[PDB]
């Protein structure tokens, strides 16, 4: 109930961006998983707060990198890049187009036509300040193991719909997916030197940031 | 409906912290406004992601600075301080005690026994990476004007319950408060070089971070 009145007021009141609205329309036309406006604003916040200094930039692992990427590019420091990863070629065309239409230079974005877990093995460790992942619950754990090394301290890994609306921790709900999402959550909460925040956005967002060195 | 199952699973699954649980019990015993566990985790994330370099640290403006402060201290870099602000002396005793009980050194915290809007005039501009405010809707605008100058670029101002559960933008709802919260929201969305994210936490959280310099 109350979630939607908040959503409605925030959505019906956020100044519309043409490039963003276009990317949201495109994603919907192709049936792609697209984080809502509130989740995107939080992506802009993290891209803006995370440290661009010494950072290559951000990584967006999702079929709809255009929508997500636009939110990230809004906050990211100019001397960093957005690296998008998806194996589908029309998704590469879909993304580069949206960036082109928005006023973005090609030098700010990089698209890797690959399966996420295959190419992350080819990126530099400790070089990224932000990683957004939109994957299947069965890939969550692998994505965490793949992304963690790439993340810099003060860096955040953002996992969309990772909580399956709370579906997890439910006797009735036996499922290949629910069980994988449950193991991911339990696994994520077990890693050391990580800050875990699980928020009421989309189907439940898990953001895990790499802790800085602490005396306490 | 779905918000609580997510909340329940996340709350019932977040590894309990003694110092934090104590601060949450204390706040409840004194009837103080206390952000839930999910909002606190997001505070840790921002304290961890924002830049401690060249920053004095964070500011917590709230009657329950102990609970809020503990979440912030978890992420904040060691070479920064948490500045708490409240005019009530038992709140100062309440906070310093909770920090003392948690393993925190007195050098990491600073308490200013003052009314927020009176003392912010006495702090250094462009020196803070994070400011959390828990105020009345009638003080929101003034808090933004007071906090903005103190915030560094890449810095975030976090305003608790600023959306009044979406209550705003409602013909029926005439009110001294709703009208002030509405003007604050409209005013906040008008400032330039600011990233505004409004999220479904508490009664509606507004976080506005100071944008970095952008060519785009």
From TrEMBL, chains A, B:
<dbReference type="Pfam" id="PF01596">
    <property type="entry name" value="Methyltransf_3"/>
</dbReference>
<keyword id="KW-0489">Methyltransferase</keyword>
<keyword id="KW-0949">S-adenosyl-L-methionine</keyword>
<protein>
    <recommendedName>
        <fullName>Methyltransferase</fullName>
    </recommendedName>
</protein>
<keyword id="KW-0808">Transferase</keyword>
<dbReference type="InterPro" id="IPR029063">
    <property type="entry name" value="SAM-dependent_MTases_sf"/>
</dbReference>
<dbReference type="GO" id="GO:0008171">
    <property type="term" value="F:O-methyltransferase activity"/>
</dbReference>
<dbReference type="GO" id="GO:0032259">
    <property type="term" value="P:methylation"/>
</dbReference>
<dbReference type="InterPro" id="IPR002935">
    <property type="entry name" value="SAM_O-MeTrfase"/>
</dbReference>
